[PDB]
Design a protein around this motif. Structure first.
Motif, PDB file in Angstrom:
ATOM      1  N   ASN A 205      97.325  -9.148 -13.460  1.00 28.84           N
ATOM      2  CA  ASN A 205      96.987  -9.565 -14.815  1.00 28.84           C
ATOM      3  C   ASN A 205      95.905 -10.636 -14.803  1.00 28.84           C
ATOM      4  N   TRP A 206      95.998 -11.588 -13.872  1.00 24.56           N
ATOM      5  CA  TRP A 206      94.973 -12.621 -13.768  1.00 24.56           C
ATOM      6  C   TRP A 206      93.658 -12.071 -13.235  1.00 24.56           C
ATOM      7  N   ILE A 207      93.709 -11.042 -12.387  1.00 23.52           N
ATOM      8  CA  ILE A 207      92.479 -10.366 -11.983  1.00 23.52           C
ATOM      9  C   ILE A 207      91.806  -9.738 -13.196  1.00 23.52           C
ATOM     10  N   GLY A 208      92.603  -9.188 -14.113  1.00 24.97           N
ATOM     11  CA  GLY A 208      92.041  -8.632 -15.333  1.00 24.97           C
ATOM     12  C   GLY A 208      91.356  -9.660 -16.216  1.00 24.97           C
ATOM     13  N   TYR A 209      91.859 -10.899 -16.224  1.00 24.05           N
ATOM     14  CA  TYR A 209      91.296 -11.928 -17.098  1.00 24.05           C
ATOM     15  C   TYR A 209      89.871 -12.300 -16.707  1.00 24.05           C
ATOM     16  N   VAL A 210      89.535 -12.208 -15.418  1.00 22.24           N
ATOM     17  CA  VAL A 210      88.228 -12.641 -14.936  1.00 22.24           C
ATOM     18  C   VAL A 210      87.096 -11.835 -15.558  1.00 22.24           C
ATOM     19  N   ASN A 211      87.373 -10.602 -15.994  1.00 16.72           N
ATOM     20  CA  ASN A 211      86.340  -9.762 -16.590  1.00 16.72           C
ATOM     21  C   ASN A 211      85.720 -10.389 -17.832  1.00 16.72           C
ATOM     22  N   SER A 212      86.420 -11.322 -18.481  1.00 14.46           N
ATOM     23  CA  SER A 212      85.878 -11.959 -19.678  1.00 14.46           C
ATOM     24  C   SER A 212      84.647 -12.796 -19.356  1.00 14.46           C
ATOM     25  N   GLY A 213      84.640 -13.461 -18.198  1.00  7.24           N
ATOM     26  CA  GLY A 213      83.527 -14.323 -17.846  1.00  7.24           C
ATOM     27  C   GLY A 213      82.289 -13.600 -17.363  1.00  7.24           C
ATOM     28  N   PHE A 214      82.405 -12.313 -17.037  1.00 10.48           N
ATOM     29  CA  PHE A 214      81.278 -11.555 -16.507  1.00 10.48           C
ATOM     30  C   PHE A 214      80.433 -10.889 -17.583  1.00 10.48           C
ATOM     31  N   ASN A 215      80.927 -10.796 -18.818  1.00 14.41           N
ATOM     32  CA  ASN A 215      80.220 -10.040 -19.850  1.00 14.41           C
ATOM     33  C   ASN A 215      78.780 -10.492 -20.081  1.00 14.41           C
ATOM     34  N   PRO A 216      78.450 -11.789 -20.115  1.00 15.53           N
ATOM     35  CA  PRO A 216      77.030 -12.163 -20.227  1.00 15.53           C
ATOM     36  C   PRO A 216      76.172 -11.637 -19.091  1.00 15.53           C
ATOM     37  N   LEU A 217      76.724 -11.518 -17.883  1.00 12.62           N
ATOM     38  CA  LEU A 217      75.939 -11.010 -16.761  1.00 12.62           C
ATOM     39  C   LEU A 217      75.534  -9.557 -16.977  1.00 12.62           C
ATOM     40  N   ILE A 218      76.436  -8.736 -17.512  1.00 14.50           N
ATOM     41  CA  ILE A 218      76.128  -7.322 -17.708  1.00 14.50           C
ATOM     42  C   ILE A 218      75.323  -7.109 -18.983  1.00 14.50           C
ATOM     43  N   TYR A 219      75.885  -7.417 -20.145  1.00 12.34           N
ATOM     44  CA  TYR A 219      75.192  -7.078 -21.412  1.00 12.34           C
ATOM     45  C   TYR A 219      74.114  -8.033 -21.918  1.00 12.34           C
ATOM     46  N   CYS A 220      74.351  -9.328 -21.832  1.00 14.54           N
ATOM     47  CA  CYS A 220      73.407 -10.314 -22.368  1.00 14.54           C
ATOM     48  C   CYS A 220      72.020 -10.349 -21.732  1.00 14.54           C
ATOM     49  N   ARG A 221      71.862 -10.406 -20.460  1.00 15.21           N
ATOM     50  CA  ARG A 221      70.545 -10.574 -19.835  1.00 15.21           C
ATOM     51  C   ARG A 221      69.505  -9.564 -20.329  1.00 15.21           C
ATOM     52  N   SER A 222      68.303  -9.894 -20.429  1.00 16.94           N
ATOM     53  CA  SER A 222      67.190  -9.085 -20.916  1.00 16.94           C
ATOM     54  C   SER A 222      66.073 -10.079 -21.141  1.00 16.94           C
ATOM     55  N   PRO A 223      64.830  -9.610 -21.275  1.00 16.38           N
ATOM     56  CA  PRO A 223      63.721 -10.576 -21.385  1.00 16.38           C
ATOM     57  C   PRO A 223      63.802 -11.467 -22.614  1.00 16.38           C
ATOM     58  N   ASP A 224      64.192 -10.917 -23.767  1.00 16.31           N
ATOM     59  CA  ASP A 224      64.323 -11.737 -24.968  1.00 16.31           C
ATOM     60  C   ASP A 224      65.441 -12.761 -24.819  1.00 16.31           C
ATOM     61  N   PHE A 225      66.577 -12.347 -24.252  1.00 17.96           N
ATOM     62  CA  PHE A 225      67.676 -13.280 -24.038  1.00 17.96           C
ATOM     63  C   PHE A 225      67.294 -14.359 -23.035  1.00 17.96           C
ATOM     64  N   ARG A 226      66.527 -14.001 -22.004  1.00 15.21           N
ATOM     65  CA  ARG A 226      66.061 -15.007 -21.053  1.00 15.21           C
ATOM     66  C   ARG A 226      65.119 -16.003 -21.720  1.00 15.21           C
ATOM     67  N   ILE A 227      64.221 -15.511 -22.579  1.00 12.97           N
ATOM     68  CA  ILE A 227      63.334 -16.407 -23.317  1.00 12.97           C
ATOM     69  C   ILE A 227      64.144 -17.356 -24.189  1.00 12.97           C
ATOM     70  N   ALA A 228      65.169 -16.832 -24.864  1.00  9.83           N
ATOM     71  CA  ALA A 228      66.023 -17.682 -25.689  1.00  9.83           C
ATOM     72  C   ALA A 228      66.763 -18.719 -24.851  1.00  9.83           C
ATOM     73  N   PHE A 229      67.315 -18.306 -23.708  1.00 13.16           N
ATOM     74  CA  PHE A 229      68.062 -19.227 -22.859  1.00 13.16           C
ATOM     75  C   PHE A 229      67.165 -20.313 -22.283  1.00 13.16           C
ATOM     76  N   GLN A 230      65.883 -20.011 -22.072  1.00 13.80           N
ATOM     77  CA  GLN A 230      64.983 -20.997 -21.483  1.00 13.80           C
ATOM     78  C   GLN A 230      64.854 -22.237 -22.361  1.00 13.80           C
ATOM     79  N   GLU A 231      64.742 -22.049 -23.678  1.00  9.26           N
ATOM     80  CA  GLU A 231      64.454 -23.173 -24.564  1.00  9.26           C
ATOM     81  C   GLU A 231      65.653 -24.097 -24.718  1.00  9.26           C
ATOM     82  N   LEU A 232      66.863 -23.536 -24.777  1.00  8.36           N
ATOM     83  CA  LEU A 232      68.048 -24.348 -25.038  1.00  8.36           C
ATOM     84  C   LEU A 232      68.282 -25.363 -23.925  1.00  8.36           C
ATOM     85  N   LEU A 233      68.313 -24.903 -22.681  1.00  5.68           N
ATOM     86  CA  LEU A 233      68.617 -25.775 -21.555  1.00  5.68           C
ATOM     87  C   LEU A 233      67.365 -26.490 -21.056  1.00  5.68           C
TER      88      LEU A 233
END
Ligand SMILES: CN[C@@H]1CCc2c(ccc(O)c2O)[C@H]1O
Length: 279
Positions: free
Chosen positions: A251-279
């Motif tokens: 069950n705890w192995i299943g929970y870890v999948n929540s933290g990986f979602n930005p790695l799979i779906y979020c990344r892309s050039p527009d998202f990288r451009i957006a992330f650059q300015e915030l940090l």
């Protein structure tokens, strides 16, 4: 002596940080507001509750070995856990179907998906998730009959999960299997279309990537969530077959999948451009 809770703490830190960053990036920057990005917002919201409310309490139960709080808090926590898990999985299924409808029929994609309809789809998903989790648990339908479950329920200090056959089977079917079949069919069709396009280009210009992307997307979800639901079905049928510690670990192995979602779906050039300015 030494505190081996750092591994549990880092999971909460990562889950909170990634989802908060994704939500802020979508909200603040108007260039990223798209119909396909509302499902990502819903998935990020589901992942964010879990890091804040389920993992922190769950760890205390494992480390302290006792549930200091009341029984009502056990019921509420279990309801939130089930709600969030089923909502996240159904959101993933919705994302897959949206990509299928985008790629398969390009001319009619704009009319099929509009900003108004996505709202209704998300609300329906969340309502269906809420019906599965809160209503049965809060009405005490899922409880078992054997003596150990009754003794666990009577004591206000212990907090363990006991369920009967019907609830376990129906919950697994609603949460995991139908979305799995739908995503399999979707991604097989998408792969076929991509292969046809590649062969057409090759036959035109007389002078891998899709497989890698599909492998990542399908494999992370299957490896994260498939092993748990099999033992979820099995443990009811054969009581002595599977011990508890394996159940908690999976069950705890299943929970870890929540933290990986930005790695799979979020990344892309527009998202990288957006992330650059915030940090
Ligand atoms: C507290 N652990 C629960 C137990 C049963 C269960 C979970 C998740 C989704 C479901 O559909 C379930 O039936 C697990 O998170």
């Amino acid at each position: 002596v030494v505190g081996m809770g750092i591994v549990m703490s880092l999971i909460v830190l990562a889950i909170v940080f990634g989802n908060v960053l994704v939500i802020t990036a979508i909200a603040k920057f108007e260039r990223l507001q798209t119909v396909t990005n509302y499902f990502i917002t819903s998935l990020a919201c589901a992942d964010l509750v879990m890091g804040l409310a389920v993992v922190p309490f769950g760890a205390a139960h494992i480390l302290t070995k006792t549930w200091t709080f009341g029984n009502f808090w056990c019921e509420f926590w279990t309801s939130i856990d089930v709600l969030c898990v089923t909502a996240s999985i159904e959101t993933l299924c919705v994302i897959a179907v949206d990509r299928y409808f985008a790629i398969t029929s390009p001319f009619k994609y704009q009319s099929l998906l509009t900003k108004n309809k996505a709202r209704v789809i998300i609300l329906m998903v969340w309502i269906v998730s809420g019906l599965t989790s809160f209503l049965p648990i809060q009405m005490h339908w899922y409880r078992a009959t054997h003596q150990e479950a009754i003794n666990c329920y009577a004591e206000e200090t212990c907090c363990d999960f006991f369920t009967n056959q019907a609830y376990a089977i129906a919950s697994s079917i609603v949460s995991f299997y139908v979305p799995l079949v739908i995503m399999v069919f979707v991604y097989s069709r998408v792969f076929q279309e991509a292969k046809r396009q590649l062969q057409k280009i090759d036959k035109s210009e007389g002078r891998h990537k899709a497989l890698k992307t599909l492998g990542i997307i399908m494999g992370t979800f299957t490896l994260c969530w498939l092993p748990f639901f099999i033992v979820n079905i099995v443990h009811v049928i054969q009581d002595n077959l599977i011990r508890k510690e394996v159940y908690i670990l999976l069950n705890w192995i299943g929970y870890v999948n929540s933290g990986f979602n930005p790695l799979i779906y979020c990344r892309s050039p527009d998202f990288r451009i957006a992330f650059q300015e915030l940090l």
